[PDB]
């Protein structure tokens, strides 16, 4: 009944991005439909090429070329290319070629056959010189067409059809470039794309784990790394086996009375089924396979984008060309600006969704051991009698404490599997202090002397032939740094191993305790041990600090840090995968901001957008690097421990520190992303008031709060009301201006 969050998060992100994309595309399609009712040059249109050609014919103009697409003209007016009349060619060509061959025209005899010779409407150079300035001098006839440089060949027909269909038949990057007079509506493009994504997800989910009994292709060898025979093969076969149920609905969308209306319902039903089956099978994925699933899905998507669509467009062009042998393939500037803005936000939405998915994988990918860690730490503190251990305040009950409740715990028949003998430490500082005047303690810490860098013998200093048996045990590189109340301690100090057996522990305790080694000065003692648990696969770094600020009274505290030890050399674990693409996103953001810094020049300071885009970069870089540091430290500590297992300690506390720092950073980044998502809500017309009212209200509000706090931490503002007063006035005024 264990739940895997990876597939749930992926499907949720896909569905949300589909919903937002459809919401944008509906408005864009409404705008296009309103439109569907400069590269060229607006040179003199004194054209009188229509002489003795009495008919109300129509003229079709096609601005051919690279990134060029234009619709046909019309005959609108009192004359409107009437009997023995002419016309002036001046329309709004949305796209036309540059300094290249851009000419394609046709005349449809909408009535009688026009008997004239229309050469050209010469547009030499007015806006961008989309073509040259010459003439064709072609006699008009019934269905007369002429094209070429600035009929039935099967040599350039194929290239023309490929050109007009290279970015319209390619379903992936066709939502940006729907040509007018098309019944595909640009909104079922999104439905088709999300259908393909969800079918990819479902196929790759049901393939992994759920089904295999043929040759044990899935099983013990779960090597998620790409071996070219384990990951890409599944993606390619999944991409191939989905087209038989994809091309049918794609065909039914195109071309016929009313089935297309319920085609959307059918598509959503099949998408819902594909999501449901993946969600139901997600329970039985071990963590090592859930990443291979994602990699296979990513490979499958890239296959249908880099070779499955090009062959589609080529074969459809060949079908349309070889057989059926067909031949036919003020506000205006603001509308173009609106279209460009819509395109920009649409292309930013995908990047934002991908980044949100990445950070969700980084943060909540392993969010199933979060409860277990809480239960483990609660179990550990309650067993050690934490409230009883904190209650002691003298330096003599410590011994009966750790002689009746600690030794049975650490040493027992089963006694909570340990993975490592405990240690005892000390610091004495060699600048021994004196008792303070009676009364309350000096809670600021005093007697800051040198540091212990000397060796002593049993009892205290008495070297005879050799060096001190109680060496300082010089600190490592990683260290610990507990940040104690009196001072921030280091890992250096004289250490004892507390024996290995239960009776040995008691014997060592008594024998070493009758010598009074930590009774006079004793800056701190510390007591730390490890508590690996196999049931949930979690470790626990447990430490018990006890501080002596004043010779007599002792301060004590404890902390239990549970974590999940995962080594970097384990392979391609999920944190490793999600912490390297975060670096890629950070580099992308940094280069995108640098491409704007020099583009605008200088004086880009005192701008929040110029600073909010650097805090994000720093946070992403820190999150990426801290996880790698944690993995490296964990691997180093584990190999050091295995090297000297029966006699070493290895102090796993550094890994616990890093595993908490990384989790904090990953949560902060997600919080910032959620705040940005909240900010992106202003696009609704009636809901844009709140954010901008807040924007105009914050400066003076912060100023007056600072003024009040300077005058005084008593509750004056939120005590009864003041902020509502300003907010009401600003909101009322701004909403009055809006209406």
């Amino acid at each position: 009944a264990d739940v895997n969050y990876i597939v749930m998060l992926t499907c949720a992100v896909c569905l949300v991005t589909y919903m937002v994309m459809a919401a944008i595309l509906h408005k864009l399609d409404q705008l296009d439909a309103s439109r569907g009712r400069r590269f060229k040059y607006e040179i003199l249109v004194k054209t009188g090429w229509g002489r003795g050609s009495g008919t109300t014919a129509h003229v079709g103009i096609m601005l051919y070329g690279v990134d060029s697409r234009s619709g046909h003209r019309h005959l609108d007016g009192d004359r409107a290319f009437h009997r023995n009349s002419l016309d002036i060619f001046r329309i709004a060509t949305p796209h036309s070629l540059g300094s290249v061959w851009k000419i394609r025209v046709w005349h449809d005899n909408k009535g009688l056959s026009p008997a004239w010779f229309l050469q050209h409407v010469i547009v030499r150079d007015l806006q961008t010189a989309r073509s040259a300035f010459f003439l064709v001098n072609d006699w008009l006839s019934v269905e007369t067409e002429a094209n070429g440089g600035l009929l039935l060949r099967f040599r350039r027909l194929l290239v023309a059809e490929l050109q007009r269909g290279f970015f319209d038949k390619h379903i992936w990057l066709s939502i940006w470039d729907r040509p007018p007079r098309s019944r595909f509506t640009r909104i079922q493009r999104a439905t088709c794309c999300v259908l393909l994504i969800c079918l990819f997800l479902g196929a790759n989910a049901v393939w992994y784990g759920a089904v295999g009994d043929s040759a044990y292709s899935t099983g013990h060898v779960s090597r998620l790394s790409p071996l070219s025979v384990d990951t890409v093969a599944v993606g390619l076969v999944s991409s191939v086996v989905v087209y038989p149920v994809y091309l049918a609905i794609l065909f039914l969308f195109r071309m016929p009375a009313w089935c297309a209306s319920l085609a959307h319902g059918l598509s959503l039903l099949l998408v819902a089924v594909a999501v449901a089956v993946s969600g139901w099978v997600g329970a039985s994925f071990p963590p090592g396979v859930s990443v291979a699933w994602l990699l296979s899905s990513s490979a499958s998507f890239l296959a249908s984008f880099l070779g499955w669509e090009p062959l589609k467009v080529l074969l459809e062009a060949l079908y349309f060309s070889l057989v059926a042998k067909r031949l036919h393939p003020f506000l205006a500037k603001e509308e173009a600006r609106k279209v460009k803005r819509l395109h920009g936000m649409l292309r930013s939405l995908l990047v934002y969704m991908l980044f949100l998915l990445v950070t969700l994988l980084a943060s909540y990918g392993d969010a199933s051991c979060h409860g277990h860690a809480y239960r483990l730490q609660s179990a550990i503190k309650q067993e050690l009698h934490s409230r009883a251990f904190l209650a002691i305040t003298r330096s003599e009950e410590l011994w009966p404490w750790m002689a009746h409740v600690l030794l049975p715990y650490v040493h027992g028949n089963q006694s909570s599997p340990e993975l490592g003998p405990p240690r005892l430490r000390q610091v004495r500082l060699q600048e021994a202090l004196y008792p303070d005047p009676p009364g309350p303690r000096v809670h600021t810490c005093s007697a800051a002397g040198g540091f212990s860098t000397s060796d002593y013998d049993v009892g205290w200093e008495s070297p005879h032939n050799g060096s001190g048996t109680w060496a300082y045990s010089a600190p490592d590189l990683l260290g610990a740094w507990s940040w104690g109340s009196c001072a921030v301690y280091d890992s250096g100090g004289y250490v004892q191993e507390l024996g290995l057996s239960l009776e040995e522990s008691r014997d060592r305790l008594r024998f070493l305790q009758l010598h009074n080694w930590l009774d006079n000065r004793s800056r701190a003692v510390f007591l730390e041990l490890t508590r690996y648990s196999p049931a949930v696969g979690l470790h626990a770094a447990v430490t018990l600090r006890l501080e002596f600020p004043a010779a007599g009274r002792a301060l004590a505290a404890l902390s239990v840090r549970p974590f999940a030890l995962r080594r970097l050399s384990a392979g391609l674990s999920l944190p490793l995968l999600t912490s390297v693409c975060l670096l890629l996103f950070a580099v992308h953001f940094a280069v995108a901001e640098a491409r704007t810094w020099h583009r605008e020049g200088r004086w880009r300071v005192l701008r929040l957008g110029a600073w909010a885009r650097w805090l994000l970069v720093a946070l992403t870089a820190a999150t990426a690097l801290v996880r790698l540091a944690q993995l490296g430290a964990a691997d180093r500590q584990w190999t050091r421990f295995v090297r000297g297992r029966p006699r070493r300690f290895t102090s796993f506390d550094q890994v616990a520190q890093l595993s908490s720092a990384a989790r904090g950073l990953a949560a902060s980044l997600l919080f910032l992303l959620l705040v940005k998502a909240a900010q992106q809500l202003r696009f609704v017309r009636q809901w844009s008031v709140f954010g901008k009212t807040l924007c105009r209200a914050l400066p003076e509000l912060l100023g007056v709060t600072l003024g009040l706090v300077v005058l005084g931490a008593l509750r004056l503002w939120g005590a009864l009301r003041l902020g509502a007063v300003i907010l009401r006035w600003r909101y009322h005024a701004l909403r009055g201006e809006l209406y």
Binding site: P437, P438, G439, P699, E700, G703, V704, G707, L708, V710, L711, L720, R721, L722, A724, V725, I726, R728, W729
Partner: protein, 472 residues
């Protein structure tokens, strides 16, 4: 032009506030309030004896009061050594406590004709015209001598239930437990006080050698003629031995500098009065300057009085068998609090003067002129309802609630209810009906009406000021 008068004055006020803050930084400890609260709370912890445990509030009947009197009633200050008597080696046996009691005489009125043979000990309220100096008992020692208060180096009483005059008798303790215990036992053998005592005050002076600062403890007891006694106790950190190190010299220099600055300001004001607009009070803003001048004068007078008391107190410590007389310089903590308040007011004035540099972040917070008084009309109508609820609660409750025992703290209980601290564990069984009704009708009328109108009264003022600024 038009900028020096708003910059130089602001800078001078800020500098004065900084100097005052520096002076007050080494004036009193940050735990002064906590220390005062602890001293006030632990002033009524006197046991009875080894037989009974009748405390001060548990000894009102015969045997309870007898047990309270016989025991450690006078053994608190004197403790056996591990002569001298130091509880924690901080306040040694250097001096003795003092006790002052004021009494009145009966028979100062005529009983009614009907109750002529029934009412004989009919005594009215004590007053200045009801002072007597008649001693009772056998004259054996000097403890029954009559003396005044002016010649005994004393002062008035200023009690709670009775502000009696300086007449009465005084008693002094010893420097050791051996004689004090014998004296207490001898005094307790027979009667020691009468029922005509009006005000009683016990004053104790302690050296407190751990930290060089005089300590004074005052316990007041007053019995009126209408029945009932109001007991109280307090402590004050008297300043008479503050000369220890260079910090005292720095404080004296700061006081001298403040006095010189006040004199310079007064001279400037005088030079800008007789040759300028004088006897003018229709400004509604110069009252702040007048209050600042009054506060400076009050601080100067407090410093002068403290210096005079210190000079007068320099004649003590002549012998090693007497007590330190600190009954004339017990206004040090109050003076320090007043000085801190004056420094805060000076900082506020400097901030108000210098906030004019703000474009629009401080112009909306300057609405005193638009709201000249304009607000006491709400404070009065709030306090009337508050006092009405306090009276109602003190009458209906006050016998089985353990909280609403007296008015001054019923006010505090209602304040804590407003703040959020609600008990509601004793009101319900004190009175099942009219108990919950009080609580509900109080919370409804406080949290929904008055506290909700005090927001509107300043909301409309802000809107009006903003409208004026926009139209101008």
């Amino acid at each position: 032009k038009y900028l020096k008068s708003v910059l130089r004055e602001l800078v001078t006020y800020l500098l004065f506030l900084i100097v005052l803050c520096i002076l007050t930084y080494g004036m009193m400890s940050s735990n002064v309030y906590y220390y005062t609260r602890m001293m006030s709370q632990l002033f009524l912890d006197t046991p009875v004896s080894k037989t009974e445990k009748t405390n001060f509030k548990t000894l009102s009947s015969m045997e309870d009061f007898w047990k309270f009197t016989e025991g450690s009633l006078l053994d608190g200050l004197y403790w056996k050594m591990q002569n001298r008597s130091f509880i924690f080696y901080e306040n040694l046996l250097l001096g003795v406590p003092r006790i002052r009691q004021l009494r009145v005489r009966n028979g100062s009125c005529s009983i009614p004709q009907d109750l002529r043979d029934e009412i004989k000990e009919c005594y009215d309220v004590y007053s200045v015209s009801s002072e007597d100096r008649a001693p009772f008992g056998p004259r054996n020692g000097t403890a029954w001598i009559y003396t005044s208060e002016k010649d005994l180096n004393g002062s008035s009483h200023w009690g709670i239930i009775a502000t009696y005059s300086g007449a009465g008798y005084y008693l002094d303790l010893s420097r050791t437990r051996e004689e004090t215990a014998a004296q207490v036992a001898s005094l307790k053998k027979n009667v020691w006080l009468d029922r005509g005592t009006r005000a009683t005050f016990i004053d104790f002076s302690v050296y407190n050698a751990n930290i060089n600062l005089f300590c004074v403890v005052r316990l007041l007891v007053e019995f009126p003629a209408t029945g009932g006694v109001i007991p109280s106790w307090q402590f004050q950190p008297l300043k008479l031995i503050r000369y220890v190190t260079t910090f005292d010299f720095f404080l004296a220099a700061c006081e001298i500098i403040f006095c010189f600055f006040i004199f310079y300001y007064v001279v400037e004001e005088i030079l800008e009065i007789r040759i300028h607009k004088l006897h003018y009070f229709r400004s509604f803003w110069n009252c702040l300057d007048v209050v600042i001048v009054v506060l400076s004068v009050v601080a100067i007078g407090i410093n002068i009085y403290r210096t005079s008391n210190v000079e007068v107190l320099l004649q003590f410590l002549e012998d090693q068998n007497t007590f330190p007389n600190f009954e004339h310089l017990a206004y040090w903590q109050i003076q320090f609090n007043n000085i801190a308040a004056v420094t805060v007011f000076f900082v506020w004035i400097k901030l108000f003067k210098f906030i004019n540099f703000n474009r629009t972040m401080s112009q909306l917070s300057t609405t005193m002129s638009r709201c000249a008084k304009d607000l006491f009309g709400f404070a009065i109508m709030f306090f009337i309802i508050f006092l009405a609820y306090a009276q109602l609660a003190y009458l209906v409750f006050g016998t089985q609630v353990d909280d609403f025992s007296t008015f001054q703290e019923c006010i505090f209980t209602q304040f804590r209810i407003i703040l959020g601290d609600i008990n509601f564990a004793e009101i319900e069984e004190a009175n099942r009906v009219l108990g919950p009704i009080y609580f509900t009708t109080f919370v409804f009328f406080m949290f929904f009406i008055l506290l909700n109108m005090f927001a509107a009264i300043i909301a409309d003022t802000y809107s009006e000021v903003k409208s004026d600024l926009a139209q101008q």
